[PDB]
């Protein structure tokens, strides 16, 4: 049954399921190969191992894609009649259900690297099925949520752990030394608190520059603060006008207008979808239908260099996709850096309007809202006679995400974020969700709501 009171309790259960999902893989390991590409795997669910979600954050956009592509084509293109699926969801269940188990099977069914000898004789019924169970439970819940809800930050919290739980995990797990902290060549006692105590006495070795380059994660963490500052700044911007509600006179009840900040969220969703590209390009070249001299020709790059031999498509398809990740600027190779900046800027901009626009941003959507609760139409115009809130939403929105989608891509070249583009995107998620969460609670505060 609906009731806001019920909804908060449900959110607490959702969080609990994520914690449980992490907990089981920690006790046992399976360790016939991990499989999903290592950076990409971390972006979805940097925790567990073995049973990381394959559904949230990027298959989500696949299912919805049909709407974006056809609309943006303008004429829908030479695409088959989109229609199908009878009418309404149910197909939505079918997609994410298969894609969980589907990712584990496809990795040995097709290329990549994992010599098949069937799915498994033994390998799959243990591994594959366990991978399937975690993803299946989360999808079923997500579909249910998409029917009359609009709150909860179960999903956001796993991202929050990915930024901040990891910092403490690395600090409170070693015995070896660890990549994180010290900067010490060997043994020399490494814990975050222990390091600060010793360092106070003499130097600290970190009043910035480039340091020795890479070294501990902590050099990056100091640098983090500068990127933190810009993201918070862009939250601040609003254009207001909710005025004259519940009377007319003067007094009113504020509505925040999300403005620029809502626009960025499609780009964060887009960045994950773009990332996948290498697996599909590899499939087209080597392991698709008959050896056409166009499918091969388009992709490739996999003849030479870097010592893999098999060569993935890290030769050139990846180079267009993503930066070298070198610490300073343009770097040794201009070409690799230059192409990445151009590639993302256009894709980011096109995405930034679209999901948010369909889901409830536009003056037509807002028009339905305003009859119910009354802004009181705010000293507007008869018939709205050259529309305020209508004209300024596409112009604001397109620009709004442009700034953030620019900034993450440029920031990879910059030393400051630890593993490039993904981290700047991931931090941005945290602020927006936290701000949103407070609004649903309302209850004048910002305080607890843990089980309250």
């Amino acid at each position: 049954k609906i009731q806001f009171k019920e909804k908060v309790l449900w959110t607490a259960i959702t969080l609990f399921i994520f914690l449980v999902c992490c907990q089981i893989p920690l006790f046992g390991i399976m360790s016939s190969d991990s499989a999903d590409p290592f950076y990409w795997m971390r972006v979805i669910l940097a925790s567990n191992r073995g049973t990381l979600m394959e559904l949230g954050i990027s298959p989500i956009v696949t299912s919805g894609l049909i709407m974006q592509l056809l609309a943006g084509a303008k004429i829908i293109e030479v695409g088959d009649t989109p229609k199908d699926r009878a009418l309404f969801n149910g197909a939505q269940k079918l997609f994410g259900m298969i894609i969980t188990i589907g990712q584990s099977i496809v990795y040995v069914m097709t290329g990549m690297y994992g010599d098949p000898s069937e799915m498994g004789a033994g390998i799959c019924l243990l591994i594959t099925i366990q991978l399937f169970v975690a993803g299946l439970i989360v999808l079923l819940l997500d579909e249910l949520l998409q029917k009359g809800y609009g709150l909860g930050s179960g999903i956001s919290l796993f991202i929050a752990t990915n930024i901040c739980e990891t910092i403490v995990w690395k600090a409170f797990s070693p015995t070896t030394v660890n990549t994180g902290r010290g900067m010490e060549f060997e043994g020399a006692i490494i814990a975050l608190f222990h390091l600060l105590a010793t360092r106070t006495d003499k130097v600290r070795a970190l009043r910035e520059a480039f340091y020795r380059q890479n070294l501990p994660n902590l050099m990056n963490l100091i640098a983090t603060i500068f990127v933190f500052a810009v993201v918070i700044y862009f939250q601040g911007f609003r254009v207001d006008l909710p005025i004259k509600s519940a009377r007319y006179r003067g007094q009113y009840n504020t509505y925040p207008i999300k403005l620029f900040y809502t626009s960025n969220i499609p780009i964060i969703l887009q960045s994950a979808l773009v990332s996948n590209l290498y697996v599909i390009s590899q499939m087209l070249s080597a392991r698709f239908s008959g050896n056409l001299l166009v499918s091969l020709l388009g992709t490739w790059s996999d003849t030479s260099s870097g010592g893999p031999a098999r060569a993935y498509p890290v030769g050139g398809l990846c180079h267009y996709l993503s930066p070298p990740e070198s610490f300073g600027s343009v770097l040794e190779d201009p070409v690799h850096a230059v192409v990445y900046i151009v590639f993302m800027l256009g894709s980011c901009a096109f995405f930034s309007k679209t999901w948010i626009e369909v889901s409830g941003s536009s003056a037509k959507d807002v028009a339905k809202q305003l009859k119910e609760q009354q802004m009181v139409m705010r000293g507007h115009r008869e018939t709205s006679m050259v529309h305020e809130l209508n004209r300024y939403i596409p112009t604001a929105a397109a620009f709004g995400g442009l700034c953030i989608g620019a900034l993450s891509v440029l920031a990879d070249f910059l030393g400051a974020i630890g593993s490039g583009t993904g981290i700047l995107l991931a931090v941005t998620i945290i602020y927006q969700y936290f701000e949103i969460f407070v609004k649903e609670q309302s209850e004048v505060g910002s305080m607890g709501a843990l089980l309250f």
Binding site: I24, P25, F27, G28, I29, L126, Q130, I137, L144
Partner: protein, 36 residues
Amino acid sequence: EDSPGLKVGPVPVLVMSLLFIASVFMLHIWGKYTRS
């Protein structure tokens, strides 16, 4: 949709989750647990 109607929860319902946890300990070490 699905012919089963029960989606939601509210105590002894997530049987699939309950089964899932039990299997894992068998497979390998973390507490010095047996390796299957």
